[PDB]
Amino acid sequence: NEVIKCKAAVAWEAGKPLSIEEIEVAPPKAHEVRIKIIATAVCHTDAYTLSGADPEGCFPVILGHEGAGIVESVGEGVTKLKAGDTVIPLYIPQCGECKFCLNPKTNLCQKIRVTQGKGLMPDGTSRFTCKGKTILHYMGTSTFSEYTVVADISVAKIDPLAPLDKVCLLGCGISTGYGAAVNTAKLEPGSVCAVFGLGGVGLAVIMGCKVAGASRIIGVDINKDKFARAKEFGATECINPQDFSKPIQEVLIEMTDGGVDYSFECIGNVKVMRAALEACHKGWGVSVVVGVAASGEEIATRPFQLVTGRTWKGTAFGGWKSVESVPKLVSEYMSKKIKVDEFVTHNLSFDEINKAFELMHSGKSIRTVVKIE
Amino acid sequence: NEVIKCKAAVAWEAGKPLSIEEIEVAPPKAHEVRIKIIATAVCHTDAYTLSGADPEGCFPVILGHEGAGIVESVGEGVTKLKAGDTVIPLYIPQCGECKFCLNPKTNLCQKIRVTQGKGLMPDGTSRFTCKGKTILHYMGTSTFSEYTVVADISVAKIDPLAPLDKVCLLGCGISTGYGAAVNTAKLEPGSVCAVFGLGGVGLAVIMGCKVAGASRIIGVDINKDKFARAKEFGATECINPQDFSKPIQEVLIEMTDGGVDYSFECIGNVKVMRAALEACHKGWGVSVVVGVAASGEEIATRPFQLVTGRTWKGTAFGGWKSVESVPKLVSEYMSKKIKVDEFVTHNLSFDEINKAFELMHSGKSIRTVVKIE
Ligand SMILES: NC(=O)c1ccc[n+]([C@@H]2O[C@H](COP(=O)([O-])OP(=O)(O)OC[C@H]3O[C@@H](n4cnc5c(N)ncnc54)[C@H](O)[C@@H]3O)[C@@H](O)[C@H]2O)c1
Ligand SMILES: NC(=O)c1ccc[n+]([C@@H]2O[C@H](COP(=O)([O-])OP(=O)(O)OC[C@H]3O[C@@H](n4cnc5c(N)ncnc54)[C@H](O)[C@@H]3O)[C@@H](O)[C@H]2O)c1
Ligand SMILES: Cc1cc(C(N)=O)ccc1-n1c(CCC(=O)N2CCSC2=O)ccc1-c1ccc(-n2ccnc2)cc1
Ligand SMILES: Cc1cc(C(N)=O)ccc1-n1c(CCC(=O)N2CCSC2=O)ccc1-c1ccc(-n2ccnc2)cc1
Ligand SMILES: [Zn+2]
Ligand SMILES: [Zn+2]
Numbered sequence: 001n002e003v004i005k006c007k008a009a010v011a012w013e014a015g016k017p018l019s020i021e022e023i024e025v026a027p028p029k030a031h032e033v034r035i036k037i038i039a040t041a042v043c044h045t046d047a048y049t050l051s052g053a054d055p056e057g058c059f060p061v062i063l064g065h066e067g068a069g070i071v072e073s074v075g076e077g078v079t080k081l082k083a084g085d086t087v088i089p090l091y092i093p094q095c096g097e098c099k100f101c102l103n104p105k106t107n108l109c110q111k112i113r114v115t116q117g118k119g120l121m122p123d124g125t126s127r128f129t130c131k132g133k134t135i136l137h138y139m140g141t142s143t144f145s146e147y148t149v150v151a152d153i154s155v156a157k158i159d160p161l162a163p164l165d166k167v168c169l170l171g172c173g174i175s176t177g178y179g180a181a182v183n184t185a186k187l188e189p190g191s192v193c194a195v196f197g198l199g200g201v202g203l204a205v206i207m208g209c210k211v212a213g214a215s216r217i218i219g220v221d222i223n224k225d226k227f228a229r230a231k232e233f234g235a236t237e238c239i240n241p242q243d244f245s246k247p248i249q250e251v252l253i254e255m256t257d258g259g260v261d262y263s264f265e266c267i268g269n270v271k272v273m274r275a276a277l278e279a280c281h282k283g284w285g286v287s288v289v290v291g292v293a294a295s296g297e298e299i300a301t302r303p304f305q306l307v308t309g310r311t312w313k314g315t316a317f318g319g320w321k322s323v324e325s326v327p328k329l330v331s332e333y334m335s336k337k338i339k340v341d342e343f344v345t346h347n348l349s350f351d352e353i354n355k356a357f358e359l360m361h362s363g364k365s366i367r368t369v370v371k372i373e
Numbered sequence: 374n375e376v377i378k379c380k381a382a383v384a385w386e387a388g389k390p391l392s393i394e395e396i397e398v399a400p401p402k403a404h405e406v407r408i409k410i411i412a413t414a415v416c417h418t419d420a421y422t423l424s425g426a427d428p429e430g431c432f433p434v435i436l437g438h439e440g441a442g443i444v445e446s447v448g449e450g451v452t453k454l455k456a457g458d459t460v461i462p463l464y465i466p467q468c469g470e471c472k473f474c475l476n477p478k479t480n481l482c483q484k485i486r487v488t489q490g491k492g493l494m495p496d497g498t499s500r501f502t503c504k505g506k507t508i509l510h511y512m513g514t515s516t517f518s519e520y521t522v523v524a525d526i527s528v529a530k531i532d533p534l535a536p537l538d539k540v541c542l543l544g545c546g547i548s549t550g551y552g553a554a555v556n557t558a559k560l561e562p563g564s565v566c567a568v569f570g571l572g573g574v575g576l577a578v579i580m581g582c583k584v585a586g587a588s589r590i591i592g593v594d595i596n597k598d599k600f601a602r603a604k605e606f607g608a609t610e611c612i613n614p615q616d617f618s619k620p621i622q623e624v625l626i627e628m629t630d631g632g633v634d635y636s637f638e639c640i641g642n643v644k645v646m647r648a649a650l651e652a653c654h655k656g657w658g659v660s661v662v663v664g665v666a667a668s669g670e671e672i673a674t675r676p677f678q679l680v681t682g683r684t685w686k687g688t689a690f691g692g693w694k695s696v697e698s699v700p701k702l703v704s705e706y707m708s709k710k711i712k713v714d715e716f717v718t719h720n721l722s723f724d725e726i727n728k729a730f731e732l733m734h735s736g737k738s739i740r741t742v743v744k745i746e
């Protein structure tokens with residue numbers, strides 16, 4: 001119930017490294033929760049915002065949107081979570097009252113997004129003070145800190161037995177891939193699937209396709225060093241566009257005799273998205289867009305590709321309804337139905353957080369986990 | 374069983390009028406049917422091919438792909454249809470054996486399309502002789518003639534009580550609109566729908582939406598003279614893009630509080646297709662492409678429109694399985710469930726066939742019916 005002094009990794013300008021500093025964190029107001037972050041993961045959109053390319057970037061700011069922790073304080077009006085619980089913050093809440101929350105077809109809650117995009121709590125202010133300045137929040141969580149304040153609808157409650165040093169990855173990547181495979185596509189047994197890109201999201205998609213029951217899975221990438229891991233996750237074969245003179249969709253059409261049944265696009269390249277649409281089977285093919293492109297880029301095609309059967313669709317947070325569905329995923333990981341331990345490729349300490357970004361800049365890791373205690 | 378002399382409307386070069394001539398029609402070979410055309414309808418793709426803009430146009434050729442008639446002769450191996458029957462030719466057959474015919478998700482049979490696109494019968498030759506030249510077939514039917522020869526899988530058998538002078542329209546237009554409404558979209562009661570363009574296909578789509586059970590229907594067009602008929606078919610309101618300074622998708626978003634549930638695009642303009650995608654509701658919107666664009670045009674959008682929920686899909690022949698589904702549509706018209714008599718706007722004789730095209734060039738008619746006897 002009093003201001004907490006803690007250590008954070010603040011960013012001050014676009015394109016500069018993060019600097020470790022001491023910050024003051026205010027007590028939560030009505031309908032808010034204070035969380036001590038235990039572990040976190042460094043995602044790609046964090047580095048994208050840090051670079052400064054985002055037209056909506058606001059500085060100074062504390063990044064991070066993947067982590068798990070333990071509750072200390074709750075505001076006035078909270079009757080759902082008490083101190084000592086193990087929880088996961090979420091950048092897609094679930095109020096349960098709006099028109100988007102009563103529709104089973106969607107999961108895009110639209111209650112606090114106007115303040116979340118500006119970097120402020122729902123009341124209209126920020127809880128982070130540094131040397132007489134106010135530091136904005138990032139994507140509603142801000143987990144690059146030892147303590148953080150979030151809204152009461154952005155918190156999911158998990159089993160206390162879960163290891164918090166690895167279950168944190170179920171915030172952005174593994175959940176998105178698994179949901180893309182088993183929610184937005186809903187693929188029947190015996191299908192043929194193709195995955196573009198073999199990062200964290202691609203490997204999660206491959207895992208979901210193998211779990212659901214597809215017979216043949218094709219992995220596509222321009223870096224050979226990934227192929228090995230793909231074959232461990234369930235991909236039957238892997239190809240490289242640079243080894244063929246013909247365009248990639250023609251290679252896939254020749255290989256699969258007509259085209260694949262499902263194609264997942266997990267990169268963020270508009271040309272790859274067009275190639276992914278044109279490689280689906282005529283009559284019943286489906287293409288799912290998972291990655292996010294830079295602002296100002298357009299994906300083109302001819303309407304003759306849609307008239308003869310094919311479909312575009314897209315997914316955000318794998319289509320899961322976050323608050324009521326993340327606990328089920330943690331339970332699934334308890335039963336060894338899905339793989340979480342095989343995604344983490346590196347471990348760092350808090351002070352070396354900058355090093356994490358450099359690894360992401362080189363393409364040598366899938367996911368890195370930072371221990372914040 | 375002998376060559377038949379008949380009257381036809383042959384085209385000799387791109388951009389010239391059709392000329393009425395006398396032709397010889399050969400007896401059918403194995404797995405073929407000879408039909409005496411009674412009535413026909415002039416569609417938009419006929420005039421498109423006649424203009425010469427089609428990169429695949431081949432001349433001389435006999436156009437037409439909508440009509441009903443009576444059988445005279447059948448080839449060797451036909452045990453399904455006998456002479457005197459009332460039938461409808463179809464530009465999408467149904468063999469029932471290929472991989473596309475055993476899949477309930479599609480209706481694009483791929484058995485005789487290679488010869489159909491070239492203008493020849495499956496054996497490899499044409500049955501139309503004129504003054505020592507061979508005349509190719511059009512879209513597998515060629516109904517601008519008093520007698521025509523078609524394959525045995527391109528014929529649907531209907532109730533003999535049907536009036537053949539109006540049931541012919543169930544070949545291309547009304548079927549496509551009705552199927553787009555109730556097959557590819559599958560819209561639930563209480564939905565909001567928007568239709569772009571108010572020709573024959575647009576009015577069929579409106580009829581299907583009203584039958585299925587949507588509550589609110591919005592018609593969009595740039596010609597005011599159409600709006601009246603739309604209000605008779607079930608459209609609740611109609612708008613004109615030229616009356617507003619803002620782009621049309623913003624007008625629709627403001628009007629419907631977020632966007633429509635379903636949007637059908639029935640024109641063939643790539644800019645209208647983009648505007649139709651951007652006017653669907655966030656989270657659960659769907660956009661169905663029905664019209665065909667000119668070769669070399671691309672429809673563009675940003676992937677942020679697909680990531681947040683929306684979908685493109687397309688339809689050819691309304692998704693009906695032609696041979697087994699057209700008789701059901703004729704039965705539906707017998708019970709007054711659907712409207713066929715309200716589409717025909719003009720009637721002509723065979724010799725005035727050219728006049729029909731001129732009407733289509735002015736936008737004063739929905740469908741014109743030519744009586745061929
Ligand atoms: N919509 C969502 O909810 C959501 C969630 C998480 C991530 N994402 C996005 O998914 C994308 C993947 O991110 P990530 O960190 O999981 O993996 P990553 O971006 O680090 O890996 C990208 C892979 O694509 C390959 N690549 C580059 N150009 C290629 C080309 N022409 N052809 C084939 N491969 C090419 C690269 O070699 C690489 O293996 C990102 O853009 C991310 O923003 C979206
Ligand atoms: N895929 C299929 O199976 C199939 C079947 C039949 C027809 N079609 C196609 O459907 C299209 C419609 O053909 P039709 O004969 O039924 O009607 P039509 O083409 O004669 O009517 C077109 C209407 O769109 C309007 N238009 C032009 N520009 C516009 C704009 N910017 N905004 C709004 N309206 C505009 C016109 O005023 C007109 O009312 C055609 O392109 C046809 O080729 C497709
Ligand atoms: C565009 C956007 C901005 C923010 C922000 N903070 O600026 C947050 C979310 C989104 N965004 C929306 C629009 C807003 C929206 O629909 N919703 C629903 C509940 S609240 C909310 O954000 C749809 C999809 C996304 C999205 C963006 C990035 C990632 N991504 C990439 C890598 N890692 C994460 C995943 C999804
Ligand atoms: C591109 C095409 C050419 C021909 C031809 N004769 O050149 C015939 C059909 C198509 N086409 C296909 C590819 C081929 C195909 O999938 N199939 C399935 C069974 S056979 C066959 O044609 C998919 C959709 C269409 C199509 C084209 C025009 C119209 N349209 C417009 C106005 N009025 C009619 C409707 C559909
Ligand atoms: Zn909500
Ligand atoms: Zn992320």
Ligand SMILES: [Zn+2]
Pocket residue numbers: 467468469470471472473474482483484
């Ligand atoms: Zn078939």
Ligand SMILES: [Zn+2]
Pocket residue numbers: 416417418438545546
């Ligand atoms: Zn037609």
